[PDB]
Amino acid sequence: MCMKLESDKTFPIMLNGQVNGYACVVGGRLMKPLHVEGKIDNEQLAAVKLKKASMYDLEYGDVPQNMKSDTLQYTSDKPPGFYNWHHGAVQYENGRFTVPRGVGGKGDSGRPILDNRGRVVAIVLGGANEGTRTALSVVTWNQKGVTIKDTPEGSEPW
Amino acid sequence: PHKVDQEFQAAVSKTSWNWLLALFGGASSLIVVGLIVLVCSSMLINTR
After folding, report:
1. Which of A41, A73, A92, B19 has its CA at 20 to 30 Å from residue A83's CA atom?
2. What transmembrane ranges does the database entry give (chain B) (predicted)?
């Protein structure tokens, strides 16, 4: 499902020995986290100059020629729950993105949460295991469409 | 000899106090503007 859908668009970030994060091509924007350190792969999308955000913990830029393939529409139209994912299915019950136990580790701090129609909805950043079920600190888009952050208590980046 | 002694608060002419205080108040006004826009940025990051 989503594993094939986000393929060749979710470019991983190297820790110089392994992968420590993922980078997304959203609206011509090379979105990668700031806490994820290292060098991004490829050369078409690696030699660009990125601009820090430091309030949303992302970094953005532009692609020179890949606009024909930089096709990941972001959408804030979001019914509450039942969304696909790289690993499984995520739930947006009670206005909060939720995941079952265990899944999610280092190397998985930058991959998108897709829609039912292949539209990027969320870009995961970290998580916390508390309450009834664990929750995620994640950058999304609100009802008005402005970039917003949703973060639990004690949500260290996994 | 002079009947009085010079004072720094007096020997500087009133128009020169006006010019120096005008430049200093301009600098302080731009600092106040910077703190105002920093407060506005804090309001926006509280809003998000």
Report:
1. A41
2. 19-45
Q: In whole angstroms, what separates CA A57 from the centre of its chain?
A: 11
Residue A91 DSSP label? B
Which residues of A fall below an 8 Å CB-CB distance to B? Answer: 55, 146-149
Q: Is B44 on the interface with A (CB under 8 A)?
A: no
Residue B20: which residues within 8 A CB-CB, separation 6 or more? B12
Residue type, A80: P
The resolution, in Å, is 2.9
**In angstroms, what CA-CA distances link B46 with A55, A87, A112, A138, B34?**
11, 33, 25, 17, 18
Helix (H, G, I), strand (E, B) or coil at A42: coil
Alpha helix positions (H), chain A: 2-5
The coordinates were experimentally obtained by: cryo-EM
Residues of B in contact with A147 (CB under 8 A): 48
